[PDB]
């Protein structure tokens, strides 16, 4: 149907403590599958998913190599960044980098991602045309020019149309049971009296995948935003996701409220009511 592969990179310089901390993760949709930590006792690409654990030594040697190379590239980017913004070597700085590809339903390249930020703020990002670069500020324009001069977008794109889709399809094929699934959320409504005149209605959706989902409250059939609280979708720790939405309701009007959940794991959108 719709799948994606992304890679995340975080490098943090630590003055007086040696080399910067480098942490990178690999995701297939909402499922992590690889890991590389520079501060691991033996830095190397590690399997974080049962289905990639079948890859031969080659995969891990190459993956580790590319990971370390990425780390070097990141330290390098840290220094160069210090130079662009004219910053001291005694201060800490963070470089973040996310890049991936989306596999269409026809086995083609649907869309690509390649964006990097410096100190929590946008630095430079590849446009949807997959040909031009957009810099967020003055210093990043140096990187934009340097990448325009060496045809970086061309190579990264050769990657998008090549190894990215290939290994993505492969991963999807090896982990069909857990990657090509659409586990619907186990939902239920709970009641929690705030006082004697008020009571909080909480809508629960648990153990669903992927993470994408929408919870909304309705009063008498009309959307409700007032006196409402929706928490950020959260992992269960076992590969699934959770989310709940609550609304403060006058005592005696609970039966006028309905919860609505949208998740691709459900044939149709669910309508929930308080069932004491």
């Amino acid at each position: 149907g719709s799948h994606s592969m992304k890679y995340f990179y975080t490098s943090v310089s630590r003055p007086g403590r040696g080399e910067p901390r480098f942490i990178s993760v690999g995701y297939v949709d909402d499922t992590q599958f690889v890991r590389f930590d520079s501060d691991a006792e033996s830095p190397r690409e590690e399997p974080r998913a049962p289905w990639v654990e079948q890859e031969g030594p080659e995969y891990w040697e190459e993956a580790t190599r590319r990971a370390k190379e990425a780390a070097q590239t990141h330290r390098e980017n840290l220094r160069t960044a210090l130079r662009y913004y004219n910053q001291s070597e005694a201060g800490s700085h963070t470089i973040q980098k996310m890049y991936g590809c989306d596999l269409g339903p026809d086995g083609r390249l649907l869309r690509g991602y390649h964006q990097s930020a410096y100190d929590g703020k946008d630095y430079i990002a590849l446009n949807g045309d997959l040909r031009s670069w957009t810099a967020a500020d003055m210093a990043a324009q140096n990187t934009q020019r340097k990448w325009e001069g060496n045809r970086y977008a061309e190579r990264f794109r050769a990657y998008l149309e090549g190894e990215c889709l290939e290994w993505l399809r492969r991963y999807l094929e090896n982990g069909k049971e857990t990657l090509q699934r659409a586990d619907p959320p186990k939902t239920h409504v709970t009641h929690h009296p705030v006082s004697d005149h008020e009571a909080t209605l909480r809508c629960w959706a648990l153990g669903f995948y992927p993470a994408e989902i929408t919870l909304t409250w309705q009063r008498d059939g009309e959307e409700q935003t007032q006196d409402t609280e929706f928490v950020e979708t959260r992992p269960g720790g076992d590969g699934t996701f959770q989310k709940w939405g609550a609304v403060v309701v006058p005592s005696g009007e609970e039966q006028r409220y309905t919860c609505h959940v949208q998740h691709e794991g459900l044939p149709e959108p669910l309508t929930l009511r308080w069932e004491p």
Partner: peptide
């Protein structure tokens, strides 16, 4: 599989 990153 990862992509060979390039410096700023």
């Amino acid at each position: 599989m990862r992509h060979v990153l390039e410096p700023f």
